[PDB]
Automatic annotation (TrEMBL), chain A:
One GO term describing the cellular component: cytosolic large ribosomal subunit
Keyword Ribosomal protein attributed: yes
Keywords, comma-separated and alphabetical: Ribonucleoprotein, Ribosomal protein
Name this polypeptide is given: 60S ribosomal protein L19-3, putative
GO molecular function: RNA binding; structural constituent of ribosome
UniProt GO BP: translation
UniProt similarity note: Belongs to the eukaryotic ribosomal protein eL19 family.
Keyword Ribosomal protein part of the UniProt annotation: yes
TrEMBL record, chain B:
Pfam name, any one: Ribosomal_L39
GO terms of biological process kind: translation
GO molecular function annotations of the record: structural constituent of ribosome
Domain of life: Eukaryota
Protein name according to UniProt: 60S ribosomal protein L39, putative
UniProt keywords, alphabetically: Ribonucleoprotein, Ribosomal protein
Family: Belongs to the eukaryotic ribosomal protein eL39 family.
Automatic annotation (TrEMBL), chain C:
An example molecular function term from Gene Ontology annotations: structural constituent of ribosome
One Gene Ontology cellular component annotation held by this UniProt entry: ribonucleoprotein complex
Family note: Belongs to the eukaryotic ribosomal protein eL43 family.
Alphabetized InterPro entries for the sequence: Ribosomal_eL37/eL43, Ribosomal_eL43, Ribosomal_protein_eL43, Ribosomal_zn-bd
Covalent S-S links between cysteines: C41-C59
GO biological process terms held by the UniProt record: translation
Keywords for this protein: Ribonucleoprotein, Ribosomal protein
UniProt protein name: 60S ribosomal protein L37a
Organism: Trichomonas vaginalis (strain ATCC PRA-98 / G3)
TrEMBL record, chain D:
Keyword Ribonucleoprotein appears in the UniProt entry: yes
Protein name (record): Ribosomal protein L8, putative
Region ranges (Disordered): 199-218
PANTHER family in alphabetical order: LARGE RIBOSOMAL SUBUNIT PROTEIN UL2, RIBOSOMAL PROTEIN L2
Gene Ontology molecular-function annotations: RNA binding; structural constituent of ribosome
Domain Large ribosomal subunit protein uL2 RNA-binding: 10-80
This protein's UniProt keywords: Ribonucleoprotein, Ribosomal protein
Pfam families, per the entry: Ribosomal_L2_C, Ribosomal_L2_N
Domain of life assignment: Eukaryota
Any one cellular-component term (Gene Ontology): cytosolic large ribosomal subunit
Amino acid sequence: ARHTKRILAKRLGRHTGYGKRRGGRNARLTGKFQWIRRIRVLRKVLVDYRKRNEIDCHLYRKLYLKAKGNEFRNRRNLVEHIQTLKAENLREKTLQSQIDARR
Amino acid sequence: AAHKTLRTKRILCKAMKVNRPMPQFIRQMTGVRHIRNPLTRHWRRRKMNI
Amino acid sequence: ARRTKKVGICGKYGVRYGASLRKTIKKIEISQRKKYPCAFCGKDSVKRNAVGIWTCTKCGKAVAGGAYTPTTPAALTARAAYKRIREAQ
Amino acid sequence: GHIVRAQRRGNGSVFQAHTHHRVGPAKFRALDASVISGMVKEIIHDPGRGAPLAKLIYKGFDSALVIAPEGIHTGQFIKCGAQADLHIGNILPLAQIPEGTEICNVEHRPGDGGRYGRCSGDSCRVIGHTENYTRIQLPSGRKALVSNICRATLGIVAGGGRPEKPLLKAGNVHYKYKAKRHTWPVVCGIKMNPVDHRHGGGSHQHMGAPGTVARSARPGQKLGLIASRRTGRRRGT
RNA sequence: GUUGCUAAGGGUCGGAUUGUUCACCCGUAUUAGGGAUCGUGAGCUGGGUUUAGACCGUCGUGAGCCAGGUUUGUUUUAUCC
RNA sequence: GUAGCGAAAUACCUCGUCACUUAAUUAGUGACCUGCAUGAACGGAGCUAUGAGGUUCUCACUGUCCCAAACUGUCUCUCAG
RNA sequence: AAACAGAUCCAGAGUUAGUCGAUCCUAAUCUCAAUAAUGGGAGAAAGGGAGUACAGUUGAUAUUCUGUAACUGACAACAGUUCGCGGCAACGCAUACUAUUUUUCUCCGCCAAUCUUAUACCGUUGGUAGGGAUCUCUUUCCUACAUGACAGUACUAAUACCCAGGGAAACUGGUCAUCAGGCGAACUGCGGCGUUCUGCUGGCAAAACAUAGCUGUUAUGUCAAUGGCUAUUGGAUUGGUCCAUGAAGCGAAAAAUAGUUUACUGGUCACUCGUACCGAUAACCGCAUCAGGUCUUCUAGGUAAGUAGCCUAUGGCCAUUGAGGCAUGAUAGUUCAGGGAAUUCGGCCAAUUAGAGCUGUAACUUCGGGAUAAAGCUUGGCUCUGAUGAAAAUCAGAACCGAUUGUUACGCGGAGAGCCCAACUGUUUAAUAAAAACGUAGUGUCGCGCUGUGGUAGUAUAGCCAGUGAACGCGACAUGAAUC
RNA sequence: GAAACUCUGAUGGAGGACCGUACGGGUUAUUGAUGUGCAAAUCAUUUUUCUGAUGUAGGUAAAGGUGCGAAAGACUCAUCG
C-alpha cells in the first residue's frame, strides 16, 4: 500500500526531479533505445503511405534514407514534410508535364 | 561418498561393525580386566586414513 | 563529421605505443579489413579469413594471397615471369 | 651452479611443441612412377605455421596436405608430374623447369616430402642445370646441388609480409607462442644471479667475461655469441 | 658596561632547514652550562646507524668491495618480588 | 671523452658560489663547471600518457598541535560458577 | 558456567532404479606387443553418451518404492497388409540386406547487438473465497486464482533458405547496425521446407490445493480481460575480432557403385555396482565444536544506474555464562570556542571534496590525450501543464509552500604547480622489501641448409626434445615504447 | 566547393581504455588491533585489480647437485645458497 502511493505519485511526477537521480541520462533511458523507438515509428509510417498509394516508388527512397539520418525527430515532422512535399511537388508535376507534352 | 566404490564400501562397513564396546562375558570368562577394544574410534577425532 | 583529424583506424590504441608504430599499422589495418573484388563470381566481397587465406562470401570459394593484402607484389611478378617463358617456345 | 635454461630445453617436459590443433604433416604424395591431376578441395589454416596449407585430392580419393603457393584457388586442378605445363600450382621435377624463376617446397632427396623454402613469402631460386644436379639458391643466400628427378611446387609461398606489421602488445606475442611452444618470455642472463647463468652476478649489472665463445665450449658454457667471426654493426658488405 | 665575592629558592623559551648532538639565521621579557649505564625503548617513536630486494659512482678479470651516495624494509611479555 | 648531460638516485672537499622560494631553508627549483670518480644499445638526452613508486611547494580542510575536555558501545572494577 | 539438551555415551534401525550416475567411447598422457607387423590395453562419477514424468507414502529411502501415464533397446515367433506411386519444381507418401568408398549429424573459441517463448517480478481492468486490522479513516490489507513428461493437427505469422512465374537506373527493396540484386531484385503464389509462435485439445481432474459441513466422505470453487520501457534462461537473426582460427573417438543415418532381393505395421525380458547425512554455519583441511582456508548450483519486494549499501515478507534463527557497579585505563566511535600544520623525520592520521542536470574547461601533447582538468550554479514537498512513444514510462516547464534546506540516512574523487625513476596493461621475495627490480613491444648482433645445429640420454648400435619443424625459420645473447 | 575533397548532426560500438560490484584475484597504509592471539601469519578500516599476458577446478607431464622459475636464490607438503 505504501508502494502504491509512490507509484501513483510518480505517474503525476513527484519524487522525479534533479535531486532524486543517481543514474545519468543514458543510464535511465538509453540513446540506443530512443533511436530504435524513433526509426521504427518513422519506417512504419512510410510503409503505410506506400501501400496507400500516396507516396511513389521514388519519393519513398529519398525519405527512407533521410529518416536514417536526423532529418525527422518525430512522427508529426515526417507527416508535415510529406504534406509540404506533396503540395509543392505534385501541383507542379501535374501542371508542368501535362500541358507541355502536347504543346 | 556418495559414489563410493564397492571395495571402499567394504572397508567402511568393517570399520563401523568393529567399532563397539568390548563384551561383558570375556571379563567373566578369562578374569583379566582392563582390556579395551583396539579398533574403537570416534569419527571426528581420529580419521581412518583409508 | 570526421572526428579524428590525423589518426584514423589506430584511434583504438589511444596514447600508447608511439607515433611511428601507429603510422605503420594505419596502412596495414586498413588493408586487411577491406573488401576486395572477386575474380570468379565477380562481386566485391572478398574478406580475410585467416593469415594467408582470402574467402569470398558469395562464391563460397577461397584464394591464397598475402598476409594483409590478397596480392603480394613479389607473387604478382612470378605470374609475369612464368607468362613470358610459357608464351615463348 | 644449476643447469641453465639453454640446457633445460633438451629434457623436454614443458618445452614441447603444442601440437594438438595442428591439422597434419605438410608434404607431397609419394613418388610412384605420366602426369596426375589433383583438385584443390579446400585451403585451410593450421596453427603455428604462418603459411596456409592446401588439401589436394588425387581421385577412392587419395589426399595430400601440400603447402600453398600464392594464387591457388579452390577447385583449381593442380598437375603433379614431368609433362605438366608451367602454372603457379603445378609440381614439376627440376629437370623440366626453366632457370631464373621462383619455386616453393623443393625436396632435398627425391620422394621425400619437401624441405627447402616452406615458410610464408619465401622461394628458392634456380641458378642453372649442370646435368644431374640442378643448382638452386635458398632464401638465405646459400647454394645447393639438388638432383633433377626430385620435385618442387611452382611460385612463391602464400601469406607473405606477416612481420611487416609489428605486434604492439605483449598479449599478441602470448597468443603467438601459445600455438607454437613455450619459449617466452625471456629473462636475460645478466639479470640472473651467478649460479643460474654465466653472465649473472656482481654489484652492478654487467657481463665481465668476453661474452663470445668457441664451438669447442661445453654444455653450460655455450651462452651468448657462438663462434662469431664478426660482431657489431654490419656496415656495408 | 667590564670585573670580584656570597648565593643553586625560583626562571632559562616560540620557529625555518638538517636523522642529528652541535651549528646557523627569523622573533620575544632582559637571558648559563652540566650529571644521573653519553638519565629515560616490557614508556613511546624508528628519521639515522646496521641484515636479506634494488639503483648509481670509483675499485676488482670475476664472485664481490666501499665512515661513498640513494630508496623499500617485523620494535614481543608484567598476572611474580 | 666527440654530441649531450653536469654539487646529479653519481660531487669526497661541501651546509660549493649566485638568483628564485621563506619573516627565517644543510631541503626544493634554475644557472655557473677545477666532473675526488658523467658519457653515448655498459646505451646518451627526453616526461605526452600511466604509477597503493621517490621528493618540494600553494589553496581547501581539519584535535597533528596551542591544550585539553565531554559523551557513547565492549572489556578492565565487585559477586556466583 | 548450568543441563533433563546435544554432531557426546549406550541399544537397535535405515541407503530399493532398463530411463539419475558408474559400466561403454576416446582427450592430454602412460604402457605392452609385433616388424609375415600398420596394432592391443589403460586413461573423464564436470567432455562424448539410447531412454521418465507427475501425484502419493516413511520415524529415517525416493526421478529408485506404490498408483497412474510414457519411452528406449534386445531376442522370439505370428496375424493382417504389400510387391512404387504424386508435384512443372522446391519436395511429399508404405518399403529390404551384405560390402566398398564418399559425406553428414555427434561438433565445438571469445566478444557485442536486435527480436522472442518459458519462469520470476511489477503492472493497468474487474471478481470470489477465507483470514488480519478498526477511538476515527480505509468499498481497505494479506494469502489463493494452478496443469508434468509425452502425443496430436488447425489456421493465424514470423524470419532463414530454396522453387515456379516475373525481368529491374527516374536504381529499387531492407536492417538497431553492416547491406542485397541480371550467378536474377521488387512482387504474386490460399508455393516448398526447417526452427520458433498463438489458439484448440488429449494427458486432465479421477489428481492437487482452498473454503463449508458431516463421521472416512459429500458439497461448491480454482474465473474473465491484456500490457511490460524489468530481469534471468532457452532459442532465432547477424556482426566484429586474431602473426590466436578455437578436441578426438565410439556410435548413428544417408548417398553412390556393384551383387543378393519382397517388405511394412501390430508378446517376453532388461544383469552388475553407487544411492543415508554434512558440504563449513560445529560434520572437509588446519592437533580442537579454530573469527583461517577450500569447487559449484536455485536466487523475492522497496530505495538506487545497480548481483552496491540500507530496510522487510517466505525459510532459518536468539549461535553468545549469569547477578551488580561505572571512577581510572585500553580499544572502537560521534563532537569540540578561537587559531589552522605552529605538531612531526614527514599533513602520518582524520577532515574537506563527492551522485546527477545545466554551464565552463588551461599550459603542454606522440594530436589520440590532458579532462570528472580547474571553477561556478541547481537539486525537497505539494497541485498542475506540455512534448515523445502503443506503452501503465521518462523529460521538459510553471505555480504555491516552510527553519535557505534538500546526492537530507545509506553509498560516492580533496584539488593544483614543480622535479626524479620506469614508457605503458602485466610479474615478484607464501611469513618484515611491490619497487626504480623482472617483464614487454621496438631496435641490434651471432650460429646453422638436416649425414645439420642447440640440447638431453646411457649401454640397449635404446631414441628422446626443438620437429605434425625449414632462414618472413629454429636456437644463442644484449638493449628495453616513441622522438633526437 | 570549378575540383581534390572537408564542415555540422546522427548512426555505430573498437580498445592488453576508464570508474565500480563479489564468499573473485592480489596485499598499499594505519608501521591500528592482536602479539599467554580466533590464527605456528589472523582481524578491522583504508587501498589495488576486476574480459584480460584474467581467475579457477579435475585429470595429466617435469624429481634432489635434479626439477621449475615474467629471476626474489623464489618455490619443490609449516622444512631450501
